[PDB]
Design a protein around this ligand. Sequence first.
Ligand SMILES: Cc1cn([C@H]2C[C@H](OP(=O)(O)O)[C@@H](COP(=O)(O)O)O2)c(=O)[nH]c1=O
Ligand SMILES: Cc1cn([C@H]2C[C@H](OP(=O)(O)O)[C@@H](COP(=O)(O)O)O2)c(=O)[nH]c1=O
Ligand SMILES: [Ca+2]
Ligand SMILES: [Ca+2]
Lengths: 135, 135
Amino acid sequence: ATSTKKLHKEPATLIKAIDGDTVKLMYKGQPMTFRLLLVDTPEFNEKYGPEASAFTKKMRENAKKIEVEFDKGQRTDKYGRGLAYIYADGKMVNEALVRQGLAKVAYVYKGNNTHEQLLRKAEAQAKKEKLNIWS
Amino acid sequence: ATSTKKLHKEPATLIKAIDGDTVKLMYKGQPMTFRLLLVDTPEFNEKYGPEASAFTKKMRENAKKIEVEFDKGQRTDKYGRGLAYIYADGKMVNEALVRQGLAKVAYVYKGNNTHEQLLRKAEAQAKKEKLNIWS
Ligand SMILES: Cc1cn([C@H]2C[C@H](OP(=O)(O)O)[C@@H](COP(=O)(O)O)O2)c(=O)[nH]c1=O
Ligand SMILES: Cc1cn([C@H]2C[C@H](OP(=O)(O)O)[C@@H](COP(=O)(O)O)O2)c(=O)[nH]c1=O
Ligand SMILES: [Ca+2]
Ligand SMILES: [Ca+2]
């Protein structure tokens, strides 16, 4: 019967965004996952985890230019991720996350802490304003 | 010397978008790749390939709601991809691509051709307007 031939729409959603302190990029011919130096965003299932992922996706998606800046030490972590400061039209993602209270300054290792004080300043300002993680 | 401690920014880019006739979605708890029924976008290295990928990404990224609609036949192709019509706020991605001359109507198989004439109408209109593939 013609009445039984109609189709039906079902729900779907986007695939879960990766944690906000990580970003996938093509660097010198290589897709790779970068882990953002000196910061930690919460896990997906923790308060601010999805907001931090959304924030980094927004920064990456809107950027006319993305740049990677390695520090003086190791270029990868023990999980094989690239370790860098990531910039979106000249604005450092690692600093913005901290400035908005969506990441804490964390994972400070020798040789890879050039921007430590810069990020601590951003964190202090997020705390003073009681933003997100600091609210 | 303090002068040699400065870091340097290097180029990076987004990872290549997937072909415009495919979309990755979470469906009933499962991330999977859907191949859009009844259409074919060009390959990445063919004219309109990147424009078609960009178009589908734009539709998926802006949607408040995404829906999947299977046809009456096979739910997967021989590559293990889901076969469906994909809608973004009620607008069918498969039809839009064809309507803009970014995909041709193609891969018409028995049991999975419910929207064949709808898509042929969209294609005829893209051709009449000499859009993209038809220019
Ligand atoms: C940022 C950073 C993380 N890591 C490691 C420390 C943690 O692994 P261990 O717990 O095994 O020590 C992990 C946290 O990353 P995530 O916050 O992405 O989970 O990544 C580094 O080794 N170097 C770094 O610079
Ligand atoms: C759309 C569609 C494609 N396919 C197969 C046909 C082509 O594989 P064969 O060339 O091995 O026959 C391939 C084209 O997909 P792509 O355009 O994604 O490359 O996908 C189906 O089997 N069923 C379908 O409905
Ligand atoms: Ca983390
Ligand atoms: Ca194709």
